[PDB]
Amino acid sequence: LSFSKD
Amino acid sequence: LSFSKD
Amino acid sequence: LSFSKD
Amino acid sequence: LSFSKD
Amino acid sequence: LSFSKD
Amino acid sequence: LSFSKD
Amino acid sequence: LSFSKD
Amino acid sequence: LSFSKD
């Protein structure tokens, strides 16, 4: 489970 | 911003 | 379990 | 800012 | 800006 | 796990 | 700016 | 585990 936002 | 769970 | 924000 | 748990 | 995970 | 920035 | 984890 | 900065 993973989430990323730049 | 980054999140992880194994 | 991990979280990072720069 | 960074957080980890094993 | 916000993030949450339960 | 909760994060906030104004 | 805030972070919490229980 | 809690963190805050104004």
Side-chain angles (χ1 to χ4, degrees):
Chain A
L1 190 62
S2 293
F3 176 88
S4 304
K5 161 71 168 84
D6 307 303
Chain B
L1 184 156
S2 73
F3 167 86
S4 72
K5 193 187 181 192
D6 303 323
Chain C
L1 190 62
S2 293
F3 176 88
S4 304
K5 161 71 168 84
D6 307 303
Chain D
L1 184 156
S2 73
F3 167 86
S4 72
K5 193 187 181 192
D6 303 323
Chain E
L1 186 65
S2 68
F3 175 89
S4 61
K5 198 277 180 215
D6 299 338
Chain F
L1 179 315
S2 189
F3 169 83
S4 202
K5 190 191 179 188
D6 303 326
Chain G
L1 186 65
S2 68
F3 175 89
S4 61
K5 198 277 180 215
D6 299 338
Chain H
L1 179 315
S2 189
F3 169 83
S4 202
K5 190 191 179 188
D6 303 326

